[PDB]
Nucleic acid binder design. Structure first.
Ligand SMILES: [Mg+2]
Ligand SMILES: [Mg+2]
Ligand SMILES: [Mg+2]
Ligand SMILES: [Mg+2]
Ligand SMILES: [Mg+2]
Ligand SMILES: [Mg+2]
Ligand SMILES: [Mg+2]
Lengths: 322, 321, 322, 332
DNA sequence: CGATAACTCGTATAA
DNA sequence: TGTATGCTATACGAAGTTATC
DNA sequence: GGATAACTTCGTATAGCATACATTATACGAAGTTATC
DNA sequence: CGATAACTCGTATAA
DNA sequence: TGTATGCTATACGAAGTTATC
DNA sequence: GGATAACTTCGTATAGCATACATTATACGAAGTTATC
């Protein structure tokens, strides 16, 4: 069609309207839908309802996670709607098998995993264990954790903090100003305040590294084997790295992780996030207050992030034991 | 013509719904059809004008609002899954439905909920049944101890099975809740019996000896003698477990009226409702509660504790200062 | 047209799918529109932009309130859309004129009046002054006024309260149950609980009048010259009545409604709502707690119910004088 | 008024509609027409300079144009303003609007993102809090210059009532009444909305009254009740009452600028906005003072006329009373 | 009986 | 009274006015 | 005549909000209507 | 001059 | 990462069952 | 033999609760890169 090739053409020219992470996944599900589609002798676009339904099932057979099967059907979907042609999920065949796959796989004993938690308990420990270090590497990481725990920001949002983004409350606490996050991109921003405790842990790392040199510097940066922080203002620390700072401080206190190859065996990016999220509910904070700390818009999600207490647990058990 | 194809695919993957949905899908299609041949109307495809006369009918028969909607609901799905117009996209249907809802709620119809099986009740049922011996009066006190200690649905309480059970060095059981019923389980992946409730559950495990095979289901049938008949193929039915509540409630307040009101005696939910209500009384924050049960909206939990003294209101607090 | 005679029919057919006063007012408008339409030689249906406009213009001349003209324009649009036609407020002309008529009025001086407040301080007065009487109607009127300011319910709702609707908390506080209000209609409904002191003034009138001999008995009912009750289950006390009860009680203390033809010169239906709303505001109750105490689902209405403290006022004044 | 809805360009009924919108012009705010005209004017010149057709607008061009503004360095709220007016021009004349088409829509979304990442961020008024009133008051309360007396009256009334500046330049004497307590009370007719969410009267404190009464008896504005409360004052320190001409908003914004220039000195040399008090400084200030002294968000919002928490919060966001919950936990 | 306390209708305006 | 982005103010540098130094 | 305090007007850049939609309630003086007195 | 500390990319899966 | 509404699950009188009493 | 106790299985009437839609982000092992030891 003329129109379909213009709609598509329109999109690529403004591809940056979408998240780079969206492109990465569109191209991956695309080349993966193309491969199969070829080694089966089928047309890959516009996608025929029946052929996709098949594909989805091959993905079930491959033993892939539900949510991965989704994302695939999902990117095939955007690719179309954006082209202005009806989507695969617009046919009963795709629409249903998808639910089936979501049903079958659920009972086979499959649910969604979620990051190991990094709670206050753990903060106090790691803090007191590296509180007294004098090394740049440590001084930093003990500041990256306090922020992550206190502000509940995602790791990417943190890699982005620039020094000119920090200001102070009158009483002393710090204030980071966050602009773009996973679900809000505006000029009004939002101010996430650290505490007095963490404020000092950032402060120590600020001087000990020297980044307050150019306000346009990113607050966090590399520290090479020689122990010297190498500030910058064009390249930020990869998320892969902050992810690393987690794994490490757990391969510190508890060393070597399993040979299971299972996911979330040690701390990762979301840990502090789900961590504080727990400690709050447990401390009895209101629903709205938890929503602000997290940056969530509805009970629906806050509610998700809770899997809660276990050992003796809490709630009922604490109630039964008079 | 084409619809017949949609219909076959609609079936090819019948797996896409709960066995429990199909039941009502047929149960209603059955009823709709019955009404059609008796008044002279084609039951499929449905024509608004007709559906409307049918809906206004279920009102007369006295069926409650929330039901008329399940009828209408089901009808819709039947047409949508077939390239066809639902009946609710028609101007006449949606028009009467509003008529009916306002007419019924106005005529004084009301929605009810389970009778609450609070702690006060678990304590009074623990006594007279505590020092029993009968291989049943044991299984019953253990099932109840669980229903209140986990706000697990009666259906999940069936599927539980030995393997699933394990222990915490605290000395309290901890039922692994494998095979949830939602991809993202807002309820845990591990419920944990208290201290007493554990002990009470152990008793029934030895006596019944479901223990042997781990695939066996924790609870089971118990014949007129007083002996457990373990098994790992058939689970102790939903109906069964409901009755267990029905009994205990008959054993303390006699039997039901002559009337037909529902919730005249504890049923499956009784457990949760009580649990909820009590945590409220204590001081547990709504999120903790919402989580302990496994809830996601919040109205439903407020629905339960709406009549406590704490959740009275702000004007009250203002008048009593 | 042919269809339009159907749509209009279906409509009149299940006319019970709309409120009483919706239809009441719909006709009343077509009866003003049809009028002006005859005497001016203009078709009345389908209404032509210009015509509607000339009319909306007329009403502004006849001195009507913005809010009123808006009702006329509104009813006119329901009839057209509900019958399958484009709305007259769909034409660049009707809408711009409607927007103009407001702007001009507001910019002149017009503003929207609101019920005279019946604060917590008006309760206490009306109480020690009727608290001791033994009359059959002074006992009623004081419960109503109690349930009114205490529950915030709208009079039409109050009228509908049947005895089988009341239940009790263990603390012993009546707890009325409403199911149909201006904003929502369902089987779930909400449960307004009364204070202790006020649940008492009800436990009274229930007895003294004994409307409690048949459940399906409206908690509130007429009194007669002789001071005798008069229960029912097929006749609710008139809303027009409850509006009276307020005036009366206002007379009782402030004399006679001065003659100025103006509205809100003495207590009326909403006087309890605006009242309570304002007291809570002052007292310092939160937004989500006020919203709930009045059946509102959004900050922008609670806010709409306030035109706070006069004279020495509050806030800024209190703030500067301290 | 408009650019030049063409002899052959404005084709058909876009002429009908357009005529209509102009017939009922009083339907939009004066300040709205000002922008609409200003945007067409501005789009029109880029179209001449760049050789494009100015109306109806073609997407591919509106897009090239929005990417231009971005480059000129304009802000995102400014670019949406341009797109917005252009949209009305079209919709209010019958044609299908820009950003009703894939290209404009997408570009716009892209412009927004890019800009935020370059860390562009909104500024708000510099607060005129209560400790500023006090400092500014302990200084000009000893002056007898008639100007000063006027200004101090204004600053007082401004902080005390949280009224917009345009709203103040309309308060006319006949509007000032008295309270049994001896403190003025300003009725505020000619409000801003059918439903005046802020009130129908504002009461001045006892002290802010002493401050306004001394301007009233030195200017002589009482001579004619219809007179505006505030007015000019010339080279010679002499008042000049009127009932037809109100003081401009520009001038009130000037009283704020100068009152800041007085205490803190000449203004910094960059071109940044909000480097000295402006018309919103008091509303913003008062908002913070109320928060700091424990006042319910409803009570605050009504004091200002706000109706959307999202705003009065953007003022008191960096207060300590709002540091959040995770800070309360971490802090034993 | 007729005079009265105590209570359906249309238009205007707020929720 | 609840659900849908689009109108409507202020910011401020600079140029144009008008009565007093 | 000029120079100049103190404005008013302008025009473009940006912050701050406010209403259309689609019903559903109340306000209130006037008739109309029961059972008491 | 290696050896080593400390940091792109493709698929899978959560938010 | 959020939610109106479209699927899921319990309620329960009553009929079949299958081992004990 | 005949009468339960204790259950399964039904069908319809009602409560309860959670998803499709459209992006945007994190998990993590392997491979690559650059100062420094
Ligand atoms: Mg999907
Ligand atoms: Mg302007
Ligand atoms: Mg200051
Ligand atoms: Mg000045
Ligand atoms: Mg300053
Ligand atoms: Mg000058
Ligand atoms: Mg994949």
């Amino acid at each position: 069609s003329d129109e379909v090739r213009k709609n598509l053409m329109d999109m690529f020219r403004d591809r940056q309207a979408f998240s780079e992470h969206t492109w990465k996944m569109l191209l991956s599900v695309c080349r993966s839908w193309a491969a199969w589609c070829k080694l089966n002798n089928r047309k890959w676009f516009p996608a025929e309802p029946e052929d996709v339904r098949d594909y989805l099932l091959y993905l079930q057979a491959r033993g892939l996670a539900v949510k991965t099967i989704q994302q695939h059907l999902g990117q095939l979907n955007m690719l179309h709607r954006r082209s202005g042609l009806p989507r695969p999920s617009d046919s009963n065949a795709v629409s249903l098998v998808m639910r089936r796959i979501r049903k079958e796989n659920v009972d086979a004993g499959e649910r969604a995993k979620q990051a190991l938690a990094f709670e206050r308990t753990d903060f106090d420990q790691v803090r007191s264990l590296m509180e007294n270090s004098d090394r740049c590497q440590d001084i930093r990481n003990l500041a990256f954790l306090g922020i992550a725990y206190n502000t509940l920001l995602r790791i990417a949002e943190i890699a982005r903090i620039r020094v000119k983004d920090i200001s102070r409350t009158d009483g002393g606490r710090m204030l980071i100003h966050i602009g773009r996050t996973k679900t809000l991109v505006s000029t009004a921003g939002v101010e996430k305040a650290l505490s007095l405790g963490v404020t000092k842990l950032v402060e120590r790392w600020i001087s000990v590294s020297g980044v307050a040199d150019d306000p346009n510097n990113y607050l966090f940066c590399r520290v090479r084997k020689n122990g010297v922080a190498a500030p910058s203002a064009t390249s930020q620390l990869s998320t892969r790295a902050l992810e690393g700072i987690f794994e490490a401080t757990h391969r510190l206190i508890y060393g070597a992780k399993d040979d299971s190859g299972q996911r979330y065996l040690a701390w990762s990016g979301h840990s502090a996030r789900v961590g504080a999220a727990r400690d709050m509910a447990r401390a009895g904070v209101s629903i709205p207050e938890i929503m602000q700390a997290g940056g969530w818009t509805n009970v629906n999600i806050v509610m998700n992030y809770i899997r809660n207490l276990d050992s003796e647990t809490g709630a009922m058990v604490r109630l039964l034991e008079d």
